[PDB]
Design a binder for this molecule. Sequence first.
Ligand code: S2C
Ligand code: S2C
Ligand code: S2C
Ligand code: CL
Ligand code: CL
Ligand code: CL
Ligand code: CL
Ligand code: CL
Ligand code: CL
Ligand code: MN
Ligand code: MN
Ligand code: MN
Ligand code: MN
Ligand code: MN
Ligand code: MN
Lengths: 308, 308, 308
Amino acid sequence: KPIEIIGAPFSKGQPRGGVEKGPAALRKAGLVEKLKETEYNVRDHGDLAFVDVPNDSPFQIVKNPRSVGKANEQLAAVVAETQKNGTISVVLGGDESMAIGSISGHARVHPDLCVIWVDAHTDINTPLTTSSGNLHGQPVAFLLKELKGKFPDVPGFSWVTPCISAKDIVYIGLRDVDPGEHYIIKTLGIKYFSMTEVDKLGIGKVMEETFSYLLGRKKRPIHLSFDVDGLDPVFTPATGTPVVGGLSYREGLYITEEIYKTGLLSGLDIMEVNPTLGKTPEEVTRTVNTAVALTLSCFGTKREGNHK
Amino acid sequence: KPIEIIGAPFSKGQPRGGVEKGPAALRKAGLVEKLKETEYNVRDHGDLAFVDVPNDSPFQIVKNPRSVGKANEQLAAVVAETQKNGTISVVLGGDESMAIGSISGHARVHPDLCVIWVDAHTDINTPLTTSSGNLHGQPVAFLLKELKGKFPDVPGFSWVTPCISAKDIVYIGLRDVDPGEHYIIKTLGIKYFSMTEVDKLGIGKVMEETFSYLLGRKKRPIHLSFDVDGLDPVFTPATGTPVVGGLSYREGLYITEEIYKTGLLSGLDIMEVNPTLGKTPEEVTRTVNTAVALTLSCFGTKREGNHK
Amino acid sequence: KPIEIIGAPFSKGQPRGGVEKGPAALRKAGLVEKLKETEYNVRDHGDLAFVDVPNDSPFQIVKNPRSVGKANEQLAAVVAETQKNGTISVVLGGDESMAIGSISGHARVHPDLCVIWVDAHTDINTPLTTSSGNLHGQPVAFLLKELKGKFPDVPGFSWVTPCISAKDIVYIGLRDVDPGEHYIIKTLGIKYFSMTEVDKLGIGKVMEETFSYLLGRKKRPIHLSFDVDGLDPVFTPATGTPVVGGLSYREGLYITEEIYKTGLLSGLDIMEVNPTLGKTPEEVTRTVNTAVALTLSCFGTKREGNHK
Ligand SMILES: N[C@@H](CSCC[B-](O)(O)O)C(=O)O
Ligand SMILES: N[C@@H](CSCC[B-](O)(O)O)C(=O)O
Ligand SMILES: N[C@@H](CSCC[B-](O)(O)O)C(=O)O
Ligand SMILES: [Cl-]
Ligand SMILES: [Cl-]
Ligand SMILES: [Cl-]
Ligand SMILES: [Cl-]
Ligand SMILES: [Cl-]
Ligand SMILES: [Cl-]
Ligand SMILES: [Mn+2]
Ligand SMILES: [Mn+2]
Ligand SMILES: [Mn+2]
Ligand SMILES: [Mn+2]
Ligand SMILES: [Mn+2]
Ligand SMILES: [Mn+2]
């Protein structure tokens, strides 16, 4: 089974530019080379070419609706192609508005996949609940079958069709949820392990419960959307929306090591790394190196060691 | 059920002045406003006016015995009044020598309450065991029925009458206990979860065991005395007596979230925040903001999110 | 039962000099004085005098083979002498190539001892697997009976005879293991709790499982080789080979407090403290003070407190 890296240098999902430099920063740190040192065969698709859309006026509150919807439509078609060729897809973010396209194309080939969303935010605001118009905080809303038609059709996402139900997703790391988002998850009954559950159960018991909840009935493809700001700002400083009291370096590597070991990883996202957002160059290097550490962990690198 | 904030800008319980600025710093950070954003109705009593006592010579080793005893006598009368009016009292410290008065007035109305003392210190030195004469480290000794008459009567605290027994208190966070204090807790058999027990059990299992130990026989009012230095100096830098290897931001918020959820919080203390003690202005802001985070957590703010 | 401190100011086990200053730094911090404040009677043997060996050419890849082998031969004879006099030996490192001599002399008197190796590295490379020729990363290989004759005889260590089997050692803290080392531990089946197992089980459950695994059949002398770099570089900065995502201050003190409580500690090593390796003087003081904290914890100092 081979790995396919896909660059998604996108920033229209939010206001801060620079996140579109995440793919390259990740590559600068030597992500591809280190990945070839693993058991997987690695192919690099390069970065997608996103067509800026000139007259992209806000749909009500939603900003850059057409740019975001057009960029995700491309990503889906690409991801669906590599999943269609039996390869694990690895999308390097820009912002997480690209998760819409990553999960969508992936779910076209493996419509039975589950989603593990490591993040400090649920990103489940709908065009009507979002306090800001940033689409990097509404991905999940465009994908959930239950939310289908709960908000007006947004220009650019007509190609979208909810692919997952509230039962196929599990959140890990939550510590910054909005009233609407919180109402949504409690009503739809989405499974989540916010920081308070990681503090109560411990990350080991969390992964165990995540797996039996998602893979208990049948083993199926896993799709991990890791948002760099899921870990504490002491580890991943260079992120647009940092929240204190998050996951530790260890707990992060633990989640990816457990997902690796399940042998079910099918799709992977490394989002929200903004190479221009730390306080110092070291904060950036720190954020990037840990992002690479997590991607490598998802593909075999164990802390106990490794040998051929 | 309403909340009543009570400012206790006191510093005679120790040598460093500045802690009496804790109430205002807390208010500066917007504590009252953020509290009104919760389900509770909030009232602010303001800061008590403490009468300095001119000829306050040390009673043996005990310093400022009359100032401390007079200030706590006032606080009790106030707290007893608001508890008497069915309102949860929130005392903002100065130093924790004010816990004597907070718990005392509270126990007048709800004589059945239990005490959860989050701190790196037991603060159970008696006027005869204390190596220094600082009364912020002897509060518990003036309140424990078992210690009644175990030390000479200290000027200013005649109005005091032990209100709680060794069985009604639980410590969390200990990592700096004196020989006398340690002898006291092991003989009286006071329940405690020092740092080594948090490391062994995990904070989730700690709160569980704290609750079944205190509320196992009958649900009763809870009195939480949170000493800002219960958390590691990486989180609450601006404190008079910092000790390394303490509670994390997460474990602290976890304790308050669990106490909130019990629905039994009746009295709350936020002590030892000294706005003039960090190394930088950020260390102060850090200490204060986390203090506010804990007070808000005690009143409903969950990390998983909230909605009306 | 008395304590015997033994200075092992050695640096030939690696390239960076300065680690030979570890004993003195440790003494500067007041290790001996603080140790006399405990229940144990303390004696200080001083620092061993290591004879530099002029024509110490590399045995194949192994560097300073004769210096290292001669220095460890002396240490064994010393340790065997104090163990022979019924005293717990405390060796202050230089580098951990001295563990060979510490464990060897110790095993001469208590051939039934088990070994708890707290470290980020397994240090089990053999002269043939080691990528560098540094002997501070091959100690375990010279001691394991199973590895006897698995590599050519190294000049200077003829006096050595494997004293422990794969079943008598337990690792704690691993997060940087080499392919050879990993093959060795998985084939010989050595018991280990790498960082991923500490994250999954928690340090409390780790010590429990360490003790029942080593002391389950019969209580026997324990030999703890603590490598300062077993704790995260945020705690022990001044170390030659720091690895991110390690043990916390608390987890470290927890391991030593549990080993103390077993009452079986017979040999202790405090290795890899290099007084000339931090980024600032505070990083050094931090490393040293925590090293002393761990040694004191191994001898009775509890975080819950202590009294006579
Ligand atoms: N609560 C925010 C969502 S921020 C989402 C950031 B990220 O995509 O990185 O998780 C809102 O209303 O847009
Ligand atoms: N062990 C100290 C007690 S320090 C108490 C500080 B605080 O009140 O903040 O816990 C003594 O002998 O006064
Ligand atoms: N993996 C390294 C071992 S570094 C050992 C350092 B220390 O002794 O401090 O654990 C090598 O091939 O020498
Ligand atoms: Cl390849
Ligand atoms: Cl429609
Ligand atoms: Cl109100
Ligand atoms: Cl009397
Ligand atoms: Cl002595
Ligand atoms: Cl031979
Ligand atoms: Mn996100
Ligand atoms: Mn996020
Ligand atoms: Mn206190
Ligand atoms: Mn304290
Ligand atoms: Mn070592
Ligand atoms: Mn090491």
